[PDB]
Amino acid sequence: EESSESALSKATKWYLLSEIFRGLYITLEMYFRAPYTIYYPFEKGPVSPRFRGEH
Amino acid sequence: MSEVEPGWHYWLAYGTDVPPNQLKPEEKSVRAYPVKKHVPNLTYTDGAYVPYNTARPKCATWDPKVTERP
Numbered sequence A: 001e002e003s004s005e006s007a008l009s010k011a012t013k014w015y016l017l018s019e020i021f022r023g024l025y026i027t028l029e030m031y032f033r034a035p036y037t038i039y040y041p042f043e044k045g046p047v048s049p050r051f052r053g054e055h
Numbered sequence B: 001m002s003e004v005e006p007g008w009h010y011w012l013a014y015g016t017d018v019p020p021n022q023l024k025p026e027e028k029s030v031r032a033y034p035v036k037k038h039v040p041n042l043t044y045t046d047g048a049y050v051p052y053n054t055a056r057p058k059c060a061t062w063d064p065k066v067t068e069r070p
């Protein structure tokens, strides 16, 4: 009896999957963003003078 | 990837902003030995590195000699 949202309002979100479509929309946003992939071995990741490799 | 010369391997990996062809004369390495063409990794070939011991055996056997008794 102390809910802030009405039963119809809570049912509309529940039946129409309000947060599911919100999650789908965020995932679609990344589809139109630049990826992070680099093309090894044609490109190399960052290195520092302190890096330890072959002796 | 091993075909990249060690001079340009560091530049490709964003280790510096000065390419080896733009190096100052004092920043270059001084070699008293001659320089040959770059050799990549030689695995899966007949030129693969073969390890071996660089030290001689720690004991030497006696060279036998015969002396006749009087």
Ligand SMILES: CCCCCCCCCCCC(=O)OC[C@H](COP(=O)(O)OCC[N+](C)(C)C)OC(=O)CCCCCCCCCCC
Pocket (backbone or CB within 6 Å): A012, A013, A016, A017, A018, A019, A021, A022, A024, A025
């Ligand atoms: C038209 C057919 C395609 C879309 C069908 C589904 C749409 C959502 C249905 C339920 C909405 C609802 O329940 O709305 C309510 C909710 C949340 O609002 P609240 O919490 O009440 O906000 C608080 C009160 N305010 C309003 C004053 C601030 O809204 C949503 O999360 C909307 C989702 C929008 C992003 C996804 C839209 C595109 C989906 C991907 C492409 C197919």
Ligand SMILES: CCCCCCCCCCCC(=O)OC[C@H](COP(=O)(O)OCC[N+](C)(C)C)OC(=O)CCCCCCCCCCC
Pocket (backbone or CB within 6 Å): A014, A015, A016, A017, A020
């Ligand atoms: C009259 C209009 C009819 C509408 C027809 C559609 C109804 C859909 C189902 C609504 C009920 C519901 O999703 O329920 C959620 C159920 C059961 O949840 P529960 O255990 O009851 O807890 C919730 C109830 N609370 C809050 C009172 C405790 O589980 C799920 O999370 C199911 C997730 C399915 C996700 C599939 C989405 C795939 C993508 C679709 C978009 C392209």
